[PDB]
Design a protein around this ligand. Structure first.
Ligand code: NAP
Ligand code: FID
Ligand code: CL
Length: 316
């Protein structure tokens, strides 16, 4: 396996990065420091996570320390839904850059296809709990993203949580200047995404798998929910390979030509999750893991399900 995948902007992206959603601000600086020390070169960030300043402290220290060069890092962040307004995109990007202590991002993603009313609240609601949309056409948001490339703020742009008709709309945008480099979507053995991934790869868009361990720390977890990490069938595949179940869950998307971004704030697990470049799942193992699909989707925000661009009503 190569450690990096070539994007349609000509840059190479590490196929393993560190996720940072839910990483507490008093733990994420150490987590990212440890991650860089143990070989991670890709960090997945977002303004909505409320921890970019602390991620940035870690990145900056490792750069200052000359543990790594900036060109060796691949830092990803995202444009939140309340900033889809072509006069807010640049400022949102710049705030992320300032917090991360960077002068460019390697990749900046539209976090969701759904624009929300601008303001202080990340999920502005009406009195019945429905998110308040913005009217901004996503094609217009895409044009705003393209400007960020042309201004030097970001090396690549992409999308997240876009369904295939939404990807297609971007690809069919009149006057499209830059194709999306990446679509970042939920993907794991219970939500295998075969249809959406084949579509994206056919267009040359790299897919990043989020929540690859099934997000056991998701705030809405229930004790009765499915558990990838506890699935005896996955544990058996892991045992056959002398690996952990997490290592199998990370290697799985890698062998589908995906990028994968497991989150941890536990130093031992950070180091564990990186030890996935020295074994191979067989094709039979891969097909077996794929067979576990159930369309079990953990990120599906109820408040957004009436938004006209909500992505998950479409089959894929
Ligand atoms: N684009 C989007 O809309 C979107 C949505 C969701 C996620 N994401 C991105 O994808 C990242 C990963 O997804 P996620 O955070 O939802 O969940 P995840 O990576 O599937 O799971 C994280 C959980 O697994 C635990 N864990 C990590 N390694 C483990 C191991 N070796 N053994 C046992 N447990 C382990 C972590 O615990 P500890 O931290 O306590 O070690 C944490 O509770 C996010 O952090 C974010 O960067 C993006
Ligand atoms: N419910 C959902 O699906 C999303 C998931 C999500 N996680 C993530 O990384 N991107 C998201 O948008 C998230 C993150 C937040 F900081 C706050 C809410 C939130 O909800
Ligand atoms: Cl964001």
């Amino acid at each position: 396996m190569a450690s990096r995948i070539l994007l349609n902007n000509g840059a190479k992206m590490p196929i393993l990065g560190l996720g940072t959603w839910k990483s507490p601000p008093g733990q994420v600086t150490e987590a990212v420091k440890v991650a860089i020390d143990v070989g991670y070169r890709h960090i997945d960030c977002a303004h909505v996570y409320q921890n970019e300043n602390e991620v940035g402290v870690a990145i900056q220290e490792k750069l200052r320390e000359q543990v790594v060069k900036r060109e060796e890092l691949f830092i990803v962040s995202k444009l939140w839904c309340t900033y889809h307004e072509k006069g807010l995109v640049k400022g949102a990007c710049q705030k992320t850059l300032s917090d991360l202590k960077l002068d460019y991002l390697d990749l900046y993603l539209i976090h969701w296809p759904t624009g929300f009313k601008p303001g202080k609240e990340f999920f502005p609601l009406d009195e019945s709990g429905n998110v308040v949309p913005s009217d901004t056409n996503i094609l217009d948001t895409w044009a705003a993203m393209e400007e960020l490339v042309d201004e030097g703020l970001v090396k690549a742009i992409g999308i997240s949580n876009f369904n295939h008709l939404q990807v297609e709309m971007i690809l069919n945008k009149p006057g499209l200047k830059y194709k999306p480099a990446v679509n970042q979507i939920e993907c794991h053995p219970y939500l295998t995404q075969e249809k959406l991934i084949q579509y994206c790869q056919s267009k040359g868009i790299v897919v990043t798998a989020y929540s690859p361990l099934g997000s056991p720390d998701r705030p809405w977890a229930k004790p009765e929910d499915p558990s990838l990490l506890e699935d005896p069938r996955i544990k058996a595949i892991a045992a056959k390979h002398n690996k952990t179940t997490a290592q199998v869950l990370i290697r799985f998307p890698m062998q589908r030509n995906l990028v994968v971004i497991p989150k941890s704030v536990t130093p031992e697990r950070i180091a564990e999750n990186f030890k996935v470049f020295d074994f191979e799942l067989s094709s039979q193992d891969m097909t077996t893991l794929l067979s576990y699909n159930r369309n079990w989707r953990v990120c599906a925000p109820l408040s957004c399900t009436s938004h006209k661009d909500y992505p998950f009503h479409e089959e894929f």
